[PDB]
Design a protein around this ligand. Structure first.
Ligand SMILES: Nc1ccn([C@H]2C[C@H](O)[C@@H](COP(=O)(O)OP(=O)(O)OP(=O)(O)O)O2)c(=O)n1
Ligand SMILES: [Cl-]
Ligand SMILES: [Cl-]
Ligand SMILES: [Mg+2]
Ligand SMILES: [Mg+2]
Ligand code: NA
Ligand code: NA
Ligand code: NA
Length: 327
DNA sequence: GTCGG
DNA sequence: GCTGATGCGCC
DNA sequence: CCGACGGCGCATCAGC
């Protein structure tokens, strides 16, 4: 039981319908902003009107909140749940590497279930095949206890490649979450800055060492600065194995560490809303820089940054600890 | 879907 | 190959 | 067919 749990689950469910079925990404974003502001609200919502006062709730969402508050359900969602087609499209998007577009296509050709995907593996790309192979594993959360073991493995192996590397586990882990959806690792090295890429293969050396020791087991995508893949803790004899887990590693210029760690710590909705506040203050924020906004459209050169807090400072936000950036 | 130019 | 658009994903 | 909305890495396709 969470305070306005009913409402936020309804809106979250509709968000996912819009993104996955209607391919209406802004409606997705609207529903999520509403869910977010309502989850922050410290009172029980008693009407649509009350909700309408909040930023990002308008007429239509207020009417839905009135309906749900009177009846305990939403007709629109009942119909969507009874629609086999919608339900298949939505389910398939949960496979890593099947987005809304591929899900729709698969369903159009009558591929609607996990069994159907295994029968039509030849229709899937490498990434999708891996998402399917570990589907059950990727559904499951990682207890913090395991995240700590995984961190120890990563930091130790990284140190063995070169002790000038610094690896920081971000995402929900950094936000103090008791369980995590995956492992996000921010990487820096003194040879890679906004000025110069001096050393080649900097990210590659880490990935290959983590592969050598059989921690990283599969690669979904890979470039010079981002690794997206799979890893697994070692297990003991006749102990059942650990689930395979999703891992993301991001290599950021050392001199842009605070912008990177801010981005990688999230949450996602926090980030979008911090970046949104930046815009209405005449700045733009990415994982590399905070820049002031001109007029021609263009951003100006990066502003100096010496902490996560300095970024909040530019935009008139009081600092938020990582744990206070979750939903 | 909402908000604001 | 390029530029630009799309589809996958990340926080 | 009021348009903006947060921003970008990697992979792949279109029209050169
Ligand atoms: N668990 C199973 C069952 C059957 N098959 C085989 C038999 C067929 O050669 C092919 C599937 O053909 P179907 O058209 O029966 O499979 P569909 O998934 O299309 O049938 P449905 O309409 O029931 O979804 O795969 C399989 O690989 N695995
Ligand atoms: Cl939309
Ligand atoms: Cl920085
Ligand atoms: Mg994560
Ligand atoms: Mg996430
Ligand atoms: Na409102
Ligand atoms: Na997916
Ligand atoms: Na991740």
């Amino acid at each position: 039981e969470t305070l306005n749990g009913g409402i936020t689950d309804m809106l979250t469910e509709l968000a996912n319908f819009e993104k996955n079925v209607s391919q209406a990404i802004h409606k997705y974003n609207a529903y999520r902003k509403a869910a977010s502001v309502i989850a922050k609200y410290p009172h029980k919502i008693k009407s649509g009107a009350e909700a309408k006062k909040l930023p990002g709730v308008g007429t239509k969402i207020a009417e839905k909140i009135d309906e749900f508050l009177a009846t305990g359900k939403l007709r629109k969602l009942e119909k969507i749940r009874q629609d086999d087609t919608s339900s298949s499209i939505n389910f398939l998007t949960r496979v890593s590497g099947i987005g809304p577009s591929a899900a729709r296509k698969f369903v159009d050709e009558g591929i609607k279930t996990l069994e159907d995907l295994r029968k039509n593996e030849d229709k899937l790309n490498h990434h999708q095949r891996i998402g399917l192979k570990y589907f059950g594993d990727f559904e499951k959360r990682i207890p913090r206890e395991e995240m700590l073991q995984m961190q120890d493995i990563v930091l130790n192996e990284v140190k063995k490649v070169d002790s000038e590397y610094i690896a920081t586990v971000c995402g929900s882990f950094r936000r103090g979450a008791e369980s995590s959806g995956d492992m996000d690792v921010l990487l820096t090295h003194p040879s890679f800055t906004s000025e110069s890429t001096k050393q080649p293969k900097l990210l590659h050396q880490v990935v290959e060492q983590l592969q050598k020791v059989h921690f990283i087991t599969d690669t979904l995508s890979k470039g010079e600065t981002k690794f997206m893949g799979v890893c697994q803790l070692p297990s003991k004899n006749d102990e059942k194995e650990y689930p395979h887990r999703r891992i993301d590693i991001r290599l950021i210029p050392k001199d842009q560490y605070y912008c990177g760690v801010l981005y990688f710590t999230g949450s996602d909705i926090f980030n979008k809303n911090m970046r949104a506040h930046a815009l209405e203050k005449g700045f733009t924020i990415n994982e590399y820089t905070i820049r002031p906004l001109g007029v021609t459209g263009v951003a100006g050169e990066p502003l100096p940054v010496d902490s996560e807090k300095d970024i909040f400072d530019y935009i008139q936000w009081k600092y938020r600890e990582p744990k206070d950036r979750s939903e």
